[PDB]
Design a protein around this nucleic acid. Sequence first.
RNA 1: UCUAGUGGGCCAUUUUUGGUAAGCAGAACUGGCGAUGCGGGAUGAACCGAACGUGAGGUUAAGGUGCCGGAAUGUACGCUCAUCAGACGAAAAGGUGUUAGUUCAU
RNA 2: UUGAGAAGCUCAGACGAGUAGGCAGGCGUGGAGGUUUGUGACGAAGCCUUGGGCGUGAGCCUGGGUCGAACAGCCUCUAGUGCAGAUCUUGGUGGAAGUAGC
RNA 3: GCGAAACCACAGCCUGGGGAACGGGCCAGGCUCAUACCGAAGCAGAAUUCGGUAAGCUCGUCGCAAUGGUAAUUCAACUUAGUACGAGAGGAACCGUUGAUUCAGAUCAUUGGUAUUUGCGGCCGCGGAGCUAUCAUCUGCCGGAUAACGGCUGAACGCCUCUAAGCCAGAAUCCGUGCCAGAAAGCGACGAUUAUGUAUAAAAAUAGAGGUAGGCUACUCUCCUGUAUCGUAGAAGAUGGGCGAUGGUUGAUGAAACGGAAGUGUUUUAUUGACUUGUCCAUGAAAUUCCAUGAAUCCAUUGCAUACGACUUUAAUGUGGAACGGGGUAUUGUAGAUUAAGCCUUUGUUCCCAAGAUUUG
Lengths: 106, 186, 332
Amino acid sequence: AQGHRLYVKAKHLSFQRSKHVIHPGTSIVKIEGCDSKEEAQFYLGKRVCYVYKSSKAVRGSKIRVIWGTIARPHGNSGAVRARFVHNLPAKTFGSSLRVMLYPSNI
Amino acid sequence: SEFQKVVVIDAKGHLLGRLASVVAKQLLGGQKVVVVRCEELNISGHFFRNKLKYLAYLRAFHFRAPSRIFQKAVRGMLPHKTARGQAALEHLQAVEGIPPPFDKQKRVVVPAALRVLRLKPGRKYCTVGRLSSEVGWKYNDIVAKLEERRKVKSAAFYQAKLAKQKKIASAKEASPVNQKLSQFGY
Amino acid sequence: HGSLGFLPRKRASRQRGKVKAFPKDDASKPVHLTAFLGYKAGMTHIVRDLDRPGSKMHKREILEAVTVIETPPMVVVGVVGYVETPRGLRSLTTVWAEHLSEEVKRRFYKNWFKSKKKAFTKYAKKYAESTQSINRELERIKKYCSVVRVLAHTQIRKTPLAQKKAHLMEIQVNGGSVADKVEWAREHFEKTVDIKSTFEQNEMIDVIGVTRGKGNAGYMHRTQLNSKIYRIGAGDDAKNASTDFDATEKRITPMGGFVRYGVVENDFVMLNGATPGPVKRVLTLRKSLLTHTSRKALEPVSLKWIDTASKFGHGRFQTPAEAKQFLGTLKK
RNA sequence: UCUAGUGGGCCAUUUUUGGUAAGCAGAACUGGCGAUGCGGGAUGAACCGAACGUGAGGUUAAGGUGCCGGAAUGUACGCUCAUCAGACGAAAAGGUGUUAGUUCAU
RNA sequence: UUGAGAAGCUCAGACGAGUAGGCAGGCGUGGAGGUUUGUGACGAAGCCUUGGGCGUGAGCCUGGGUCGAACAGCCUCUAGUGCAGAUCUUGGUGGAAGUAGC
RNA sequence: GCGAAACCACAGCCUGGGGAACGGGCCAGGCUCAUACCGAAGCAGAAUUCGGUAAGCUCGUCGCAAUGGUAAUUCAACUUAGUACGAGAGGAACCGUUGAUUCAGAUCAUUGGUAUUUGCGGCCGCGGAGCUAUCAUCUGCCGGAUAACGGCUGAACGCCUCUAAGCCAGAAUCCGUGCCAGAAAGCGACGAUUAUGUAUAAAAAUAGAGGUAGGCUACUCUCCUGUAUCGUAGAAGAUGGGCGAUGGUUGAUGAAACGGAAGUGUUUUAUUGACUUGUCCAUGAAAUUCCAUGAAUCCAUUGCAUACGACUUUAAUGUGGAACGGGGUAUUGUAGAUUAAGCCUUUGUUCCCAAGAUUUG
């Protein structure tokens, strides 16, 4: 059919790292469909979230969300830097993300 | 750009190193990659050059199947000593030929790894399956026999699809709505 | 331990010989059998003129120290279809018999008496109730196959052994087409096969088997090579041990049975060398992988005289019948 | 005015005199380390950057951007085919080995 | 404008590796003088704790449990005052081991 | 049953590099005399030499083979031919035979002994079975790729030119092959059995292909990627009225066909059930009034086995087996006894048992 999907699919690649030092405060996010740093400027400031599930349920809901915001582009290939309210776990490398269309300026 | 939950890649005419690097990067992205026709992988250089390269490796387990040759190249481009690189390997399925489950699925190609778009004209290149035929692999003859059998069935399906497509294509211009509001580029 | 190929020498798990490499077949070749399960009836020295042009024993009488193998007829109650795959040679499906003998049913089990005799019973129902499903299986085999083998088993009750689980092992139906292979298998279904039909007494046989353990020497599956056949004697044949030269009737079994084996009452074959394993041990007799063109196989065999003396102890007479008149009247 | 400690060297640079199978040895000249972590250099104490309170953001150095690995499978020219390249002393030369060719002969 | 523990309050700029060594200010322990019109059988001290808090740190405060008769903060005085090492001393206890073995 | 002590930073796979040891911690990775072959040499041929190449010397039942080791191994003579060569004599390639081996594979028939029939006759005289043997009898590989090496053809160098394209010949080598194992953590067949559209199938060249059409020869068009195509409107999608399709979207079962490879899914539907936003209307969904959303094993039997299990059948009411009673049987031996023990075998006998537990979804 056709769902809602008012967001854009994205992937968690890695932390902002050098060769041997990592900085989990900033995460590198690949917004799929964005292919250059100029294109990444559209998604700057948008709200990105990591939706996952836990077996224990809270308020009758098993879905937990970590909210973040895209800060700046990273590299020439359209990858961006995102800072989350809680630093994303290291195990979520390659995990999917949702990039909202808000806040909007179009 | 856009991705898929599972990807089937046709390894006919793809360079071994170029395809393995792209596949290894995609595996670390969480994608599931299935590479078919692993015995038609091409490597730049003379077939003498790769024969001695493999012969030097023969001199651990020396796998002879072309699929396991490609998996070895992909394995070296992953952090296999850690759990992250261990999970990436389990998300890859390299097979020779096209098995039935992936026979009726779309097979994409990687232009960054295609030999025609990456090798100088007239350069000598060797085929992995052909190269592996004289190192211990003894199923090349049968694998080709199934391949022609699959091609005949695949071609018959294409003709059925093409003949069916002619019906909608003919009826596409029959409906006046197409011509009435074709100003949208459709 | 000089042969590095056998090292590390470890005892073979399966006592029955395993046909690891079947001979190559062709459509022109008639559908036929290569491997035949047998038992070491014994061995006996027999004299035979050596007919070999160019040899220094050419047309010369030479005693042949040879070995005799007990080969009861071969009942087949199953067929397997092997389809070639990129990973390997896989068995598409197995079609056993609608009626299985007690012996082959004993093979599937570890014991016959404790169990409720439930081996392949519900299968025997669906075979009889729905023969069309079996026809589909045979149809599936014929359309998709390159290698066809039969699940033939031995008749232990005919043999003088405490064995009761019928030894079963795949035998390729070499020759013809896959459809022709299935047709022959379907018509010979639940039927016995005699080794005399398989081997023409001049064809080339490389006996394979498992040897005798020693207190890892022994229980080694080893394939003998260049052991020609000289006679496939039948069990009902009382003239098997009496050739044209020695017309005096005699049975291959020495009087008082073979040494540590027993009496032979079924079809037996004749070959030289020593087969892996002692008397009354399962042996497999198969056609040679390579067409041995040496004159040893090419030369016709005209056996001169079979010996049947009491090999146990010291037997001075090959058959009792002649010794009755030769030696004086006994006090009894 | 009086009052603690030091009162070894290593390596490196340059200068050096003779050397002498060749290397090297000998002094001297000068700093660094020795009291000093950090980025790179696969790794490594001497190499390339940089010298240090606790942090947020930004930008760089040296080195890097196929994958492991953060970052262009960037652009524009060329050179290289190895059947041991390259990538980071037998070493001089030879090559029916090339690439660009130049010059001179016709 | 109350912001005079003038030993306080306040404004500004620069700076921050560190062995030997130099200097300053603090934390903790036993006992002594003074003090808190101090704490305690409605539970002192001690010990236990994935309870909480404070301090850059030495350390300190506290909840719960256990426990049963003493104890602490502040100013000063005093010293047998702070340990991971010394093939340290005494005591307890492990792996080797249910081994060697008898 | 009683029972120490030395010792004890912690550990414990390698390979390299890591400059100072660095491996145990660190960094990157795993877990050629002969002969075979030919080439050259007078090398008359024999005799051969040299040159290299060449390291060969759940429970099962039945299968497939990833991966290793490794098919033989060393050499001869006769036949060939007693001849090509050669004045002749001596002695050709290839063929068969006789072989000599090594090692391995066997077996005790032949074979000699050892020999728990330690059996027997008089401590001896020896010994059947079993086993063993350069102590016996014996059996024992393959086709290609090519190396050296010499080519054919063919460029550069209108030819020539082992070579740069190609086609080759040619090795006890290598690879295959065969054999030996079998991925304890490989696999197949068969039997019995307590998320957010999770959307898309040609092949093929690319230095040309496909479609399209005519009768492989002539056509045409498209490619120049998917920024494509399918699909998509409704309280995630309500309630009716319709009109219009009277079609489409599908669910449900009832199905036949196709799909071996890893077919496990493609269709074809038959009927029925609903939906339909195709074109329209009439109501409805909100104050959450700015994001948070039954067999097997053990068991007994069993020897067929031997560090130990394992191994091996039999064995749970009948060739039931296990025992003897034996017979047969040869032994030694002067006929007798043992009489299968790893000699055979029993219309003989009794015993026990349509087991005893355990394991197992």
